[PDB]
Write a protein that binds this DNA or RNA. Structure first.
Ligand SMILES: Nc1nc2c(ncn2[C@H]2CC[C@@H](COP(=O)(O)OP(=O)(O)OP(=O)(O)O)O2)c(=O)[nH]1
Ligand SMILES: [Cl-]
Ligand SMILES: [Cl-]
Ligand SMILES: [Cl-]
Ligand SMILES: [Cl-]
Ligand SMILES: [Mg+2]
Ligand SMILES: [Zn+2]
Length: 562
DNA sequence: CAGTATG
DNA sequence: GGCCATACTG
């Protein structure tokens, strides 16, 4: 998947050019070029070899750039990127890539204290600015390393589907699933753990490695193999035989924590659970399929997302396995963005998208101004009017007229009451001073929670993955205040951010609280990231009950007043 | 070969 | 650290 390879090269030029001080319109132009190119689904292979006017249908794309997608896909390299690299060390680049730093600051620092690489930094670090801004940099350095090479799930997912077809449709591959971290729907992944049911695996493994998505081979076999892709990632393979495919799936999905409560049950029940089967003596009492095993250990098939050793095993033993949301059930997205703000879409495009998707509704929750220091209280009203007066010049689904409203530090909101009144949906989510002590930052959220027009609490922790640690608050008390005001909480399925995450999502929902689900979609493709959130719901043990997205337009609306 | 790391 | 099968070091 070399759409990364390109979007990579864009953002690079951006960062150097920005650093060097050239035109800021070209500059953002690249950043946005990469940001769609990274999150496309279909491949550039094609439209590259399909003329240019179809290539510019992609948002952010144009001529000046177009002639670079030439330079690249057509002719290989990128002349400007070279010329920039010539003037700007990779040393220094890694300095911008440091969260907190970034071009300007990076320049500042370089002309300030000749800082030109990471070690250069780390030293200086150990000795305008501010002593927070500086310790903010440290914090970044950390997450940088601390996160380190683990990727977010959706940043690869369609690529792990990409493979699975490829793997299934090899010769000598009867069945095959993606397992491990990805099948468990954990927010972050380290590697793709695959399984393959095969008698003859030395045509499996042998031709596994021979796939066009491989850079380097690291390990071969006849029952297994490791690979390090062109993109960076590691995908393993295991090859249990057909009679065992079920235990195969179990072992290769784990988790370690979960698979250990399991094997223990086999022990204390006179049995032996492996990656091959479950046994009494040499007789395999299960393996053929995965339920057929779980049933063999006296349990009701547990869902990957629950496989953590956090309750699932215990609850299985009473039939008390909870009822979970399913992608089927979701009747709408509850945060997307249009061209009234950072979104890239007209409303038609957004509509048509929700239709094919098969939603009953959709909120077009653009941003209040407390973000790009658009829309104005007035342009808010007009927007609402355009929407409402758009709504009835079209069928269903129904575009709710909504807004992601910033919280002010005091806890006041970023539009006024007077506006809020006219909205269908009211999101609220911080984008500002993320680091105040837990319980003063807790005031803030409660102080936000005081307004009664407030519907959802959007991407609550502000967590940007590998870029910003969650924010710090007494959630205990927050969701408390949100239960007792009829206020919902968001799972934001966008891959780079997943507020609410698994462990907070569970807590809340099982505090009595409702839940909003969304993709924060800024381009049409981003809608796909729904099940990402549903997946993450399921892991927080959540049923369709008390999920605003599982209501129907009307009902929801009804709820929206009460 | 056992002893240890590893998925 | 509670598991059970394997591949690598020695
Ligand atoms: N029985 C047993 N199985 C294990 C052990 N360690 C790992 N496994 C299984 C469970 C998960 C599976 C896949 O390997 P990974 O750890 O790479 O995958 P993951 O656990 O989902 O997370 P990630 O892919 O991000 O690492 O290997 C162990 O000590 N015993
Ligand atoms: Cl985690
Ligand atoms: Cl339904
Ligand atoms: Cl007011
Ligand atoms: Cl009113
Ligand atoms: Mg692994
Ligand atoms: Zn947002």
């Amino acid at each position: 998947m070399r759409n990364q390879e390109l979007a990579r090269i864009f953002e690079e030029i951006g960062l150097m050019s920005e650093f060097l001080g050239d035109n800021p319109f070209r500059v953002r132009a690249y950043h946005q070029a990469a940001r769609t190119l990274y999150d496309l689904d279909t491949p550039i292979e094609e439209i590259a070899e399909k003329g240019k006017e179809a290539l510019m249908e992609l948002p952010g794309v144009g001529p000046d750039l177009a002639e670079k997608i030439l330079e690249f896909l057509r002719t290989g390299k990128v002349r400007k990127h070279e010329e920039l690299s010539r003037k700007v060390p990779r040393g220094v680049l890694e300095v911008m890539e440091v969260p907190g730093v970034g071009p300007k600051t990076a320049r500042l620092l370089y002309e300030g204290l000749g800082i030109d690489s990471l070690e250069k930094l780390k030293a200086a670090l150990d000795r305008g600015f501010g002593p927070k801004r500086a310790e903010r940099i440290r914090e970044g350095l950390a997450l940088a390393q601390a996160a380190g090479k683990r990727r977010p799930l959706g940043a690869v997912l369609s690529l792990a589907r990409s493979l699975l077809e490829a793997i299934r449709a090899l010769p000598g591959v009867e069945r095959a699933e993606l397992c491990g971290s990805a099948r468990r729907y954990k927010d972050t992944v380290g590697d793709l753990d695959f399984l393959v049911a095969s008698r003859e695996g030395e045509r499996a493994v042998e031709g596994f490695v021979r796939l066009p998505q491989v850079k380097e081979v690291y390990a071969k076999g006849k029952e297994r193999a490791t690979v390090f892709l062109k993109n960076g990632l590691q995908v393993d393979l295991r090859v249990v035989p057909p009679e065992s495919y079920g235990a195969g799936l179990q072992y290769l999905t784990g988790s370690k924590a979960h698979s250990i409560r399991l094997r223990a049950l086999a022990q204390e029940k006179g049995l032996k659970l492996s990656e091959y089967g479950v046994f009494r003596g040499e007789k395999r009492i299960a393996g053929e399929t995965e339920e057929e095993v779980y049933a063999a250990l006296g349990l009701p098939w547990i869902p990957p997302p629950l496989r953590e050793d956090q309750g699932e095993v215990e609850a299985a033993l009473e039939g008390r396995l909870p009822k979970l949301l399913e992608l089927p059930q979701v009747k709408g997205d509850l945060q997307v963005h249009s061209t009234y703000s950072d979104g890239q879409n007209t409303l038609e495009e957004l509509w048509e998208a929700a239709k094919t998707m098969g939603y009953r509704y959709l909120a077009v929750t653009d941003h209040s101004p407390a973000v790009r220091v658009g829309p104005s209280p007035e342009e808010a009203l007009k927007r609402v009017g355009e929407i409402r007066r758009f709504n009835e010049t079209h069928g269903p689904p129904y575009l709710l007229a909504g807004a992601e409203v910033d919280i002010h530090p005091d806890g006041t909101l970023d539009y006024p009451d007077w506006v809020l009144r006219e909205l269908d949906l009211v999101l609220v989510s911080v984008h500002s001073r993320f680091n105040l002590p837990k319980a003063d930052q807790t005031k803030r959220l409660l102080k936000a929670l005081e307004n009664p027009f407030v519907h959802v609490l959007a991407h609550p922790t502000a967590r940007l993955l590998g870029r910003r640690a969650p924010i710090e608050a007494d959630w205990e008390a927050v969701f408390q205040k949100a239960k007792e005001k009829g206020v919902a909480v968001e799972i934001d399925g966008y891959y780079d951010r997943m507020d609410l995450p698994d462990d907070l999502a569970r807590m809340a929902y099982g505090m009595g609280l409702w839940i909003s689900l969304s993709t924060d979609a800024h381009q049409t493709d981003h809608l796909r990231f729904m099940e990402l959130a549903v997946g993450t719901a399921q892991r927080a043990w959540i049923g369709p009950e008390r999920v605003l997205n599982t209501l129907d337009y009307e009902d929801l609306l009804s709820w929206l007043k009460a």
